[PDB]
Amino acid sequence: IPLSCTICRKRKVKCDKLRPHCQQCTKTGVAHLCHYMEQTW
């Protein structure tokens, strides 16, 4: 599966992976909660 950030998976909107914060989190203003799930684990 692809990654998705922690709020984007909860609303179930398409995560974007724009650095720094997504198009979602810019617009709602949850850029603070914008972190993509790590691929190391």
Binding site for Zn ion (CB under 5 A): 5, 8, 15, 22, 24-25, 34
Q: Which is nearer to Zn ion, 2 or 25 (CB)?
A: 25
Residue 24 beta carbon to Zn ion: minimum distance, rounded to whole angstroms: 5
Beta bridge partners of 5: 36
Nearest distance from residue 30's CB to Zn ion, in Å?
7
Rounded CA-CA distance 27/5 in Å is 15
- Pick out the residues of the known binding site: 5, 8, 15, 22, 25, 34
